[PDB]
Amino acid sequence: GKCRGLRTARKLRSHRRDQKWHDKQYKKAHLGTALKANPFGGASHAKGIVLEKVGVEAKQPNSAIRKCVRVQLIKNGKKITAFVPNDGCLNFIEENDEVLVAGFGRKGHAVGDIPGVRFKVVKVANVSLLALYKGKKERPR
């Protein structure tokens, strides 16, 4: 505190309000432009169906290609790119099929060597990818 007076609270409150407004997390969490530009619309999960299966490489130090998928969302038709999570799961996902897609764990940012993408697929055709992985349940066809 700098202005310390017995009859000074409105000045302190207004200055604290302005300096709290002039932030990053509070400015993102209390403005509508971020949620308007948010594809999920401030939600944990979203549905979508598959446009096509594409491939993108990694960054400079790591040399591999990561096989994401192109899914557009159902709430508002935003076309995003979601990363198919685990090994060999690109056979299970098909073109024009419903998927359940969630974030990857950095509040809407790219994670590691994958470029730009920030979402992952959790379930395809209302069955989980973990059940298709561990040999516990078979997908309908």
Q: How far is CA 115 from the centre of its chain?
A: 13
Q: What is the contact mask toward RNA in residues 71 to 90, using x (rule: CB under 7 A)?
A: ---xx---------------
Query: What is d(CA 69, CA 104) in angstroms, rounded to the nearest whole number?
Result: 14
Handedness of CA 44, 24, 29, 41 (dihedral sign): negative
Question: Shortest distance, CB of residue 23 to RNA, whole angstroms?
Answer: 4
- 41 with 69: CB under 8 angstroms? no
- Span interacting with RNA, options 42-50, 55-63, 81-89, 129-137, rule CB under 7 A: 42-50
List 56's β-bridge partners, or say none: 66
User: Would you count residue 100 as binding RNA (CB under 7 A)?
Assistant: yes
Question: Shortest distance, CB of residue 71 to other proteins, whole angstroms?
Answer: 36
Q: Which does 75 bind (CB under 5 to 8 A by kind): RNA, other proteins, none?
A: RNA
Applying CB under 8 A, the residues found at the interface with other proteins are 5-10, 12-13
